[PDB]
Design a protein around this nucleic acid. Structure first.
Length: 72
DNA sequence: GCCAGCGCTGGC
DNA sequence: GCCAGCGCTGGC
């Protein structure tokens, strides 16, 4: 495992990071929320939100927010 | 007034 | 029934 993980997301531009935070309690205990951080430390929690920053910069049509990878 | 941590729900 | 996407709020 229930470890919080955060490091560089290679599917996104230089300096963007991906974080998994497993929930500790409640009905959804064990569910892993996924966040992304910009180079300036802004926190993102959904693909539509992310797409307003990077949608121009790059192609996010096949980016799987949940896994952090482009679908092959 | 913020925001981490959780629940709700529309769309599938 | 699942889960992407996001509303809500206790504790600070």
């Amino acid at each position: 495992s229930m470890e919080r993980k955060r490091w560089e997301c290679p599917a996104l531009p230089q300096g963007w990071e991906r974080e998994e935070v497993p929930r500790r309690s409640g009905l959804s205990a064990g569910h892993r929320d996924v966040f992304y951080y910009s180079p300036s430390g802004k926190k993102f929690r959904s693909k539509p939100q992310l797409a307003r920053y990077l949608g121009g910069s790059m192609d996010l049509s096949t980016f799987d927010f949940r896994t952090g990878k482009m679908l092959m």
